[PDB]
Ligand binder design. Structure first.
Ligand SMILES: O=C(c1c(F)cccc1F)N1CCCCCC1
Length: 284
């Protein structure tokens, strides 16, 4: 059912809360036993947000392979994403180990380091060219190469060096800096333009490892980004674009990470971005 028509029908009937609870009720429940081991307590930001065992990313080390991160593999769309929490003071070295091992080209950050007067994630990248960062626990060096600051987002070029082999790679950091402290953006224009800049970079393409996407918990804003990208890609691949069912795509993605889309307002915003995004691509 043309999702724009369903959209107006839910708005007029004021039933976003009911639609959102139905998704919550139908969503997959898989074990997360590795996340709950006592040795991993200081590797989780939130007690109620854990990666499933079946889809978790493993660190390549025999000591402790755990990170709060999930592989979202979208079979029909032919896109994969790694969704993860904002790094903690004791997991910044793990974070960059994962980027290195998974062969990612891009990191997408949808939060500010401080929001609502509290820290939402560690300062995990260097702010000045001449002050690089060394992660002694994982043997990596990270240097800021360039920074481009725009009204709604910042793009950074970073150099990651594996100190063990002296290999280097260029990583692109896409930082959406204007998501409001409360609620969702009033217009999906800045977010869709941001999505379009990540795509244009190559960061989402199959010649690279999966893009790493985070916010504070890695389920809410992070969920909105992947859901919008996958829905738009399906609407361009299929003969009948009106067959793309956002609710069904979200439940497929919830097979791989719990809690994607955290509020009925985030669900409404996800609809708005896809609907308004399709008509801009199709030529209009
Ligand atoms: O002007 C818009 C737009 C729209 F299509 C619908 C509603 C409000 C808007 F602001 N966009 C410009 C860049 C393309 C991706 C974002 C959309």
């Amino acid at each position: 059912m043309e999702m724009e028509k369903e959209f107006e029908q839910i708005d007029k009937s004021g039933s976003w809360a009911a639609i959102y609870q139905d998704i919550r009720h139908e969503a997959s429940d898989f074990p997360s036993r590795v996340a709950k081991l006592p040795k991993n307590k200081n590797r989780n930001r939130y007690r109620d947000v854990s990666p499933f065992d079946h889809s978790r990313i493993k660190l390549h080390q025999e000591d402790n392979d755990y990170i709060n991160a999930s592989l979202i593999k979208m079979e029909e769309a032919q896109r994969s994403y790694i969704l993860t929490q904002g790094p903690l003071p004791n997991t910044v070295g793990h974070f960059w180990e994962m980027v290195w091992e998974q062969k990612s080209r891009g990191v997408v950050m949808l939060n500010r380091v401080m929001e609502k007067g509290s820290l939402k994630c560690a300062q995990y990248w260097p702010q000045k060219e001449e002050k690089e960062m060394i992660f002694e626990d994982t043997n990596l060096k990270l240097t800021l190469i360039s920074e481009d600051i725009k009204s709604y987002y910042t793009v950074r070029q970073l150099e990651l060096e594996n100190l063990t082999t002296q290999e280097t790679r260029e990583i692109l950091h896409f930082h959406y800096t204007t998501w409001p402290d409360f609620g969702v953006p009033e217009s999906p224009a800045s977010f869709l333009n941001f999505l379009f800049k990540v795509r244009e970079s190559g960061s989402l393409s199959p010649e690279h490892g999966p893009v790493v996407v985070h916010c504070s918990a890695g389920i809410g804003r992070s969920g909105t980004f992947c859901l919008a990208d996958t829905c738009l890609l399906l609407m361009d691949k299929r003969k009948d674009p009106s067959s793309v069912d956002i609710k069904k795509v979200l439940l497929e993605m919830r097979k791989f990470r719990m809690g994607l889309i955290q509020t009925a307002d985030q669900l409404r915003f996800s609809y708005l971005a896809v609907i308004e995004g399709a008509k801009f691509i199709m030529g209009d």
